[PDB]
């Protein structure tokens, strides 16, 4: 397909994120690379405005890349077929003890480089919770269930954010992935799972600089 010519064995990506959590404005930029067909990617993130953030970088880490999924033979790749136009995603994340995050993301391809704009709106995190107290130590591995939905995908995840001393902050994502393609055809997948391993490396003392690595692999349900 026309999508999986434009998506080379090695792709670069850059991201602008802007938003607020409990009324705190911030901007982050990031740039990285990976292998879309191995499901592997890494990106270097800076907080350029509102830093240091008075909340866990962990609530932003899942908003920084669905072109980099290893789709086994037998499961159509919605994301790679979307190009050259790309796709959007919108997500509601409801955290166990109050917090609600709204995300609208645009994915474009410009000059063979993937471009992400991310709009983030976090509210109602408890002032003394581990998110607003910066007492989180990253995510457990994720399985996202992908469901076909009127020519897009619906993504459903139950996730675990790790907190200081052990125990977890449970949260659920529902994500709507829509293609921006207006000229052309698509092969839709059926229901399938995507396993995601999202890790932090190389964080600065106050998470002003963060490297994320992700490994995303599709499988049968």
Residue numbers in the entry: 4 to 67, 71 to 227
Study authors write:
The mRubyFT is a monomeric genetically encoded fluorescent timer based on the mRuby2 fluorescent protein, which is characterized by the complete maturation of the blue form with the subsequent conversion to the red one. It has higher brightness in mammalian cells and higher photostability compared with other fluorescent timers. Blue-to-red fluorescent timers (FTs) change their fluorescence color from blue to red during maturation. Monomeric blue-to-red fluorescent timers Fast-FT, mRubyFT and mTagFT have been developed from the mCherry, mRuby2 and TagRFP red fluorescent proteins, respectively, and the corresponding mechanism of timer maturation with the formation of a red chromophore through its blue form has been proposed.
For this purpose, we constructed the S148I point mutant of the mRubyFT (here and after—mRubyFTS148I), which stabilizes the timer in its blue state over time. The crystal structure of mRubyFTS148I was elucidated using an X-ray crystallography method at 1.8 Å resolution. There is one protein molecule per asymmetric unit, and contact analysis revealed that the protein is a monomer in the crystal. The chromophore positioned on the central helix of the barrel is formed by 68LYG70 amino acids. The chromophore is covalently bound to the neighboring F67 and S71 residues. Its imidazolidinone moiety is restricted on one side by the carboxyl oxygen of T65 and is additionally fixed by hydrogen bonds with R72, R97 and E220. The chromophore has a clear electron density except for its phenolic moiety, where density is poor. In this conformation, the phenyl oxygen of the chromophore is directly hydrogen bound to the side chain of T163 as well as to E150 and T181 via a solvent water molecule. At the same time, the poor electron density of the phenyl moiety suggests that it could be flexible as the oxidation of the methine bridge did not occur. Moreover, compared to the parental protein mRuby (corresponding residue H148), in mRubyFTS148I, isoleucine is shifted 1.3 Å closer (distance between Cα-atoms of corresponding residues) to the chromophore. This shift in the orientation of the I148 side chain hampers the rotation of the phenolic moiety of the chromophore to a cis conformation and restricts it from being coplanar with the imidazolidinone moiety. The absorption/excitation/emission band maxima at 407/410/460 nm are within a 3 nm difference from the blue form of the mRubyFT timer, indicating that the S148I substitution practically did not affect the photophysical properties of the blue chromophore but blocked the transition into the red form.
